[PDB]
Design an enzyme around this catalytic site. Structure first.
Site, short mmCIF file in Angstrom:
data_model
loop_
_atom_site.label_atom_id
_atom_site.label_comp_id
_atom_site.label_asym_id
_atom_site.label_seq_id
_atom_site.Cartn_x
_atom_site.Cartn_y
_atom_site.Cartn_z
N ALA A 50 7.85 4.09 2.93
CA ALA A 50 9.00 3.28 3.34
C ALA A 50 8.62 2.00 4.07
CB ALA A 50 9.93 4.12 4.22
N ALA A 51 7.36 1.83 4.47
CA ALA A 51 6.96 0.66 5.23
C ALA A 51 6.31 -0.42 4.38
CB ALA A 51 6.00 1.06 6.36
N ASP A 56 5.89 7.14 6.13
CA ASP A 56 4.76 6.29 5.77
C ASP A 56 3.61 6.62 6.70
OD1 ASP A 56 3.16 4.21 4.63
OD2 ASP A 56 5.02 3.17 4.08
N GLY A 88 2.59 3.37 -3.83
CA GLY A 88 1.43 2.79 -4.48
C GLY A 88 0.68 1.85 -3.56
N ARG A 121 -3.79 -3.55 -5.23
CA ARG A 121 -5.17 -3.69 -5.69
C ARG A 121 -5.81 -4.87 -4.98
NH1 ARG A 121 -7.92 -5.65 -11.28
NH2 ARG A 121 -9.91 -4.56 -10.96
N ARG A 166 -9.74 -1.66 -12.16
CA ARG A 166 -8.45 -1.14 -12.61
C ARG A 166 -8.46 0.38 -12.66
NH1 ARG A 166 -8.53 -2.41 -17.69
NH2 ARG A 166 -10.61 -3.36 -17.55
N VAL A 204 8.44 5.98 -8.40
CA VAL A 204 8.34 4.53 -8.47
C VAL A 204 6.89 4.06 -8.41
CG1 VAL A 204 9.32 2.37 -7.59
CG2 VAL A 204 10.53 4.53 -7.23
N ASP A 219 12.97 -2.59 -16.01
CA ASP A 219 12.95 -3.14 -17.37
C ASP A 219 14.36 -3.47 -17.84
OD1 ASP A 219 10.20 -2.65 -17.28
OD2 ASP A 219 10.38 -0.73 -18.32
N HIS A 233 7.15 2.08 -19.55
CA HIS A 233 7.42 1.22 -18.41
C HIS A 233 6.23 0.30 -18.15
CE1 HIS A 233 9.54 -0.22 -14.99
NE2 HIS A 233 8.78 0.37 -14.09
#
Lengths: 323, 323
Positions: free
Chosen positions: B9-10, B35, B87, B90, B96, B126, B159, B185
């Protein structure tokens, strides 16, 4: 129809503020986004949301900052409402004097550049300290001869959000939609008037603690953020809802009664005050009296007015020093 | 009534996502925020907004991230909907493959930790890539023996937002509220079905460009952010709106038809697909057919399914290697 520009749209507050305006702006409106870094990315992000009838414009200013940025001058054309949110947020590492110095110059340059192109727009000041940046904006408007005392609005609504939330938590299931908050938008200047809301109140013991909490609520969030930032999501909520009130008033879709930090036009000894006004198609339509208050609320207001006057004078002194 | 937890959430997405949920959750709801850093501050920030009848809970995990964090285990109690939006960005120096491995392990841990306490909750994935993190979640659910094919939902709605927005920009003033988007997605797996919306379409030349733009819209924002970030505001809009669809269906308040990346049950040779479903009191209530499509849309979907199958196998291979 309406073109609302967010000046400082890429910061933590501006991004969420812009998101809220994109979701609530009436069909046919334009959302204009300016920042000195990150504006194209915010615009691209928001442009992907499936709003119909919303145009998203942006402009990127030169970094490092250039006064009277030509890019802002282009963006400011045809703007009806400027939300001045740029400047540094009240995060640990800058005193209440340091914040004032860099933010005062930022407010001066931005209002100068925007009002030179769109002098009949409304200006909503959310850049802190609004007790001082609002008079600085007025002096900037005065210097170039386009000052409209009814189109300059210091956004004090976040105080009301907290005052309403805290009292609602205290007497749930008795719930009110708003609590009048007058005076200023700084700890010593925030005066909630719980005596004016319906229903029984807590004892004066509990009331004192709730009032104090409203005044130091900004610090409460900084502490809860371990000093890594300040209120941004609730800040964005207040800035958007108030911008919305101005937009609906400009469009004749409402004549709302709001509390804002505004030019008093001789109705109070203090030149600027958080006070009740009703907005119309020309901005401020009516300056309303504060209303009956308790002796303890009057004492708070008297001390608040004392430092509001000094806040104003400091801002005006800075402004004339830079012209 | 309902308790929605935002896990992550942060972050940039999580904060705006949480802000929208706070504004939109029906009276009587609970917003839970977790979080590993910044959760108390986000909770304090949002708690100051004048929502009545909304409770704001939070829990702060250990940092560095510890598996099965006990703070998350406590907050997971009594949660009806988990929004997995944790998530990691990067950073320069990561491959990757490295990115996939930390995000896949993060989804695994948080689903494992949350579902162990609230196994009948809905999980809205998500965290990207959802083509793979959704099957990873399913495998995690299956190992602990609490997998519900109707309560695991990969959020593909962004999308649809872009597909709806871009076609509305093309044919304004002819406006549609949504556009079917099936397949996956990501890049080559995103298949908009403009043939299924009302009204005349642009010629097939223009249509190809619009579909391509839907497929690469994510990098369009990364480009506009000079590589310093990705879509967060529009991502939060999609996450909050789909979470809201799930919330209203868990209550008796709607049976919405939505497009999401879900377990296909026996309906498609592909185990997971972005496809139309109708949600109800128990999550997915009906799986609907994709419907009639054009030969060009059929060909796109055939290429998409081929890579979606590989995406799934990749996620399940990672899942089997860690249990």
């Amino acid at each position: 129809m309406v073109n609302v520009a967010v000046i400082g749209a890429a910061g933590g507050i501006g991004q969420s503020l812009s998101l809220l305006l994109l979701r609530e702006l009436p069909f046919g409106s334009t959302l204009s986004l300016y920042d000195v870094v990150g504006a194209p990315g915010v615009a691209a992000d928001l442009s992907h949301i499936d709003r119909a009838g919303i145009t998203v414009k942006h402009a990127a200013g030169k970094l490092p900052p250039v006064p009277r940025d030509p890019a802002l001058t282009e963006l400011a054309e045809g703007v009806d409402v400027f939300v001045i949110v740029a400047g540094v947020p009240r995060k640990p590492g800058m005193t209440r004097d340091d914040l004032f110095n860099v933010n005062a110059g930022i407010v001066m340059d931005l209002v100068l550049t925007c009002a030179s192109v769109s002098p009949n727009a409304c200006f909503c000041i959310v850049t802190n300290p609004v007790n001082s940046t609002t008079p600085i904006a007025a002096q900037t408007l005065r210097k170039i001869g386009v000052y409209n005392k009814n189109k300059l609005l210091g956004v004090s609504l976040l105080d009301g959000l907290r005052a309403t939330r805290f009292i609602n938590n205290a007497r749930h299931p008795l719930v009110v939609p708003y609590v009048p908050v007058v005076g200023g938008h700084s700890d010593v200047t925030i005066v909630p008037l719980y005596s004016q809301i319906p229903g029984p109140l807590p004892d004066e013991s509990t009331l004192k603690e709730i009032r104090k909490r409203v005044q130091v609520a900004g610090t409460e969030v900084v502490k809860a953020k371990a000093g890594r930032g300040s209120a941004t999501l609730s800040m964005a909520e207040a800035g958007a809802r108030f911008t919305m009130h101005v937009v609906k008033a400009l469009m004749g879709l409402d004549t709302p009664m709001v509390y804002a930090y505004v030019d008093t036009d001789g109705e109070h000894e203090c030149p600027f005050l958080a006070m009740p006004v009703v907005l119309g198609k020309n901005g401020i339509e009516r300056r309303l009296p504060i209303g009956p208050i308790t002796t303890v609320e009057k004492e708070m207001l008297e001390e608040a007015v004392g430092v509001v006057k000094k806040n104003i004078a400091k801002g005006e002194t800075f402004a004339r020093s830079k012209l």
